[PDB]
């Protein structure tokens, strides 16, 4: 324009670049945006019911294949016969089986004691897990109503009760809508109120990583701001270990001896698992916990294999390389791999030869190979989300856990490159300078390989840090049953006798803004953590002393009732303004609205006790010319206090002069108006 | 010289714009690339095959 020969075009270039910088950051936020694992819920074999009871199985190298279910009506005498090929016999004589299958809380989830007998056990441990994956991600499970949040559940349709043409007595129309894989992801979105893509995918034993991949690819784009991705296989009938045994694919002892010379086949188990997932710059902007980031995912069918159940050796290399070129990484960044490790004698040699071809390509540091199926058995469709719970507790515990049955590494694989180090021992895995990435791979019977690359959470240096010890807030307990509320203060009590000195403010933040406002409420506000331990033990027995118990029906709607006269004491709020500036300042606006209409101000009145109010020209109560405005000022400041603490009235009602305060707080009369 | 900054900072603007015209038609193909229906097979109620 004027100076030199550039003052205008160099503004359109600045803009064409900050538009190119902001349009090529939109391409990397739509196909490669990290998807944070906000929380994990998991009920796995071996009594595992939470991913801190799941690390207490991997870290001690405990196998959870311990025997067939007894409480499930299984015919444990017709499942076994000396003949290897009978028609109804099963070859797995063990396996990882949970007792949480024949167990559910119908009343909590709003289903009748007849609609729930018909709920497939794969739907009843997805509703329970959906409540937990949210109650441990912070997000109140009842706060996600009409919120875009996809439920992506992986399920191998399994057969529960009477055939749909043989309807029961109470379970009749609800036998198809409680068992259809359709309504496992759908029951969750209904009970939780979610309005997002509630898709129940089915890709055999990769339906958890496919559901995780289908949720990550539903997030990178944006159709659901949040997403519950996971999968469950709880086997109601012994109909899967009696068919898988008919193709002689099972092991006679139920162990998935991964990458081991004793490999017999799958050690088929049953389990669940759910991940709460959100775009990394949506779980940092909302403060949600970020446990690990799912960098990239890939799904790749085996193609024309040598059998439907037969694995492809060059369709896994193209899925370990699609998830490795969609995450923007390379084969040398992934420290460890949670491989399938089915324990098969022709699927493990093919898996690992696909792992010396996509990862073990001149590896400077050996790849730490493992499988969670070794610890719990093949959890089928829950495997792949039980590998992103194994390699997300491996992120956050600084340790690669064991592969429990692989000391005698199989002789059908070539472990000569020294590029893969099967995890026969707990390998330390601390936070170094290079990000800690892992790979979880689930390949299925249908021939749909899936591979997901996990990375450790970006090191949060400060985040929500420390401030100063001050007034303590109520410890907010609530449950949907009077016997479940005793169990809440029988599990928070333990979560503090196991973890003592836990900041009270932190047990009143993630209990109040971390849980749902369920009917049976027992909040309380102690002196400290150890003072609350007393009330916790009292509520375990139902004895409320120091605890504020109550009952509700999702009630809300408080009413500010305003007494006119007769509620004054000699020291009304003497320290209520000395402890918080939300009452002192609340008094300040009333005072400056009372100064032009009153001489003596309210500030020194409630500041001083009656024993010291006798010398400030303001009697304790008899001065109706002074205490009536004081009453109104105390009243309005207190009402503003409850409003500042989130207590808003559905109605204000005043008695005689509390009418003035009610009008002041209702908005019909200004602060100065009602003050005058 | 190159017509100082008249034929240069304007030569970099036909790249930073022609790259913006190709990094925005990648976003219109990552979100709204219209997919075809190349063929349709149906076995539906009745004689439909």
């Amino acid at each position, epitope marked *: 324009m004027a100076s030199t020969d550039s003052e*205008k075009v160099a503004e359109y270039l600045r803009r064409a670049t900050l538009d190119l910088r902001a349009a090529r950051q939109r391409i990397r936020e739509l196909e490669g945006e990290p998807v944070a694992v906000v929380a994990m819920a998991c009920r796995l074999p071996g009594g595992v019911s939470t991913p801190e009871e799941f690390w207490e199985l991997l870290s001690e190298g405990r196998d959870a294949v311990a025997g067939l279910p007894t409480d499930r009506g299984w015919d444990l005498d017709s499942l076994f016969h000396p003949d290897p090929t009978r028609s109804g016999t099963a070859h797995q004589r063990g396996g990882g089986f949970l007792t949480e299958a024949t167990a559910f809380d119908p009343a909590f989830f709003g289903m009748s004691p007849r609609e729930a007998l018909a709920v497939d056990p794969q739907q009843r441990l997805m509703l329970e897990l959906s409540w937990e994956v949210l109650e441990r991600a912070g997000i109140p499970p009842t706060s996600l109503q009409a919120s875009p949040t996809g439920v992506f559940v992986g399920l191998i349709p399994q057969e529960y009760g009477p055939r749909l043409a043989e309807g029961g007595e109470g379970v009749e129309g609800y036998l198809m809508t409680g068992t259809t894989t359709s309504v496992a992801s759908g029951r969750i979105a209904y009970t939780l109120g979610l309005e997002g893509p509630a898709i129940s995918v089915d890709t055999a034993c990769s339906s958890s990583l496919v559901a995780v991949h289908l949720a990550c690819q539903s997030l990178r784009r944006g159709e659901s701001s949040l997403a519950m991705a996971g999968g469950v296989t709880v086997m109601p009938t012994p109909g899967m270990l009696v068919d898988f045994s008919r193709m002689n694919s099972l092991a006679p002892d139920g162990r998935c001896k991964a990458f081991s010379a004793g490999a017999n086949g799958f050690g088929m188990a049953e389990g669940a698992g759910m991940l709460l997932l959100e775009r990394l710059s949506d779980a940092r902007r909302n403060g949600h916990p970020v446990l690990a980031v799912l960098r990239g995912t890939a799904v790749n069918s085996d193609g024309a294999s040598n059998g439907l159940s037969a694995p492809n050796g060059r369709a896994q290399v193209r899925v370990i390389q699609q998830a490795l070129a969609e995450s923007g990484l390379g084969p040398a960044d992934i420290d460890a791999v949670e491989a399938h490790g089915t324990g098969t004698r022709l699927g493990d040699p093919i898996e690992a030869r696909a792992l010396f071809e996509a990862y073990g390509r001149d590896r400077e540091q050996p790849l730490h190979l493992g499988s969670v199926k070794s610890n719990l058995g093949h959890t089928q469709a829950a495997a792949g989300v039980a590998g992103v719970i194994k390699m997300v507790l491996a992120m956050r515990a600084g340790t690669l856990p064991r592969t429990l049955h692989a000391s005698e590494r199989s002789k059908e694989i070539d472990w000569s490159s020294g590029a893969i180090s099967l995890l026969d021992e707990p390998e330390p895995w601390p936070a170094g300078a290079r990000p800690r990435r892992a790979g979880v791979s689930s390949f299925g019977i249908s021939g749909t390989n899936a591979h997901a690359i996990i990375e450790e959470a970006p090191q949060v240096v400060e985040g929500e840090r420390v401030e100063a010890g001050d007034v303590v807030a109520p410890w907010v307990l609530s449950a949907s049953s009077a016997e479940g509320l005793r169990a809440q203060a029988a599990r928070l009590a333990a979560h503090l006798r196991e973890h003592p000195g836990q900041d009270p403010r932190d047990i009143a933040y993630s209990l109040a803004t971390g849980r749902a406002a369920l009917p049976h409420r027992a909040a309380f506000a102690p002196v400290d953590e150890s003072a609350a331990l007393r009330v916790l033990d009292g509520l375990a027995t139902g004895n409320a002393d120091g605890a504020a118990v109550g009952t509700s029906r999702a009630q809300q709607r408080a009413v500010f009732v305003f007494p006119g006269q007769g509620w004054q004491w000699a020291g009304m709020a003497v320290d209520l303004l000395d402890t918080s500036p939300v009452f002192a300042a609340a008094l300040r606006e009333c005072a400056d609205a009372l100064e032009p209409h009153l001489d003596f101000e309210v500030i020194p009145f409630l500041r001083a006790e009656a024993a010291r109010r006798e010398q400030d020209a303001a009697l304790s109560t008899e001065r109706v010319d002074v205490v009536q405005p004081v009453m109104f000022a105390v009243m309005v400041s207190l009402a503003s206090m409850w409003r500042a603490h989130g207590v808003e009235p559905a109605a204000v009602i005043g008695h005689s002069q509390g009418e003035i305060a009610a009008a002041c707080v209702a908005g019909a009369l200004s602060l100065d108006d009602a003050a005058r | 010289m190159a017509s100082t900054d008249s034929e240069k900072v304007a030569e970099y603007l036909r790249r930073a714009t022609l790259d913006l015209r190709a990094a925005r038609q990648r976003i219109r193909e990552l979100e709204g690339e219209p997919v075809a229906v190349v063929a349709m097979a149906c076995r539906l109620p009745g004689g439909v095959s």
Partner: antibody
Amino acid sequence: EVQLVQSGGGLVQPGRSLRLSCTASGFTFGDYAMSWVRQAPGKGLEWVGFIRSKAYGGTTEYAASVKGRFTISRDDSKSIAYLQMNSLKTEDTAVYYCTRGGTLFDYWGQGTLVTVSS
Amino acid sequence: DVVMTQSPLSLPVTPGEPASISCRSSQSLLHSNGYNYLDWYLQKPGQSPQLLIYLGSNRASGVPDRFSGSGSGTDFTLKISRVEAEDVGVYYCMQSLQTPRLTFGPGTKVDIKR
């Protein structure tokens, strides 16, 4: 983000001195050439002036309507643009904006309502 | 001299219907670089003016894809592919060839059409 948040409106009598501050946070303040566009109540935008970048000289170009009256400055270490409005008359009752471009107005800020009434 | 730019000052838009504001310049805004020096600004009613288009056809980031840009050296056009309830206001055709520009133009007074 870039946010050009402004401050400094108010009520004065014709012939006063008023300061208009443009807080720039999100971009390198010294690269752009901030400008101040006036919009009298309910009519079209009129451009008051703009300071060149410190690297472009810092020459300040003003309008014909406000030459010898207004002066515009900028600081990087304190990262603020200034419209120094001296000898105001009745015309300055308006919503003054601060855009981040001499020929390519960008963020525009928010809108500082300045009023010059007697 | 100065570039005099005019437009359909009182253009009505009905929601969901493509609309088209046009600009006509007396002089030629196609500078030698082959880049037009016309910009399209939007002042939404009672808000800070927005930059919709720079260099005639290029759209600023953060601006809805609806606003499309085109034009020769004299006649120009803004093609809103989809007018919604935020697409209403004043659309200023503002040149860049001859800085300084004391005015942003009369601006196209856009209205929801009935």
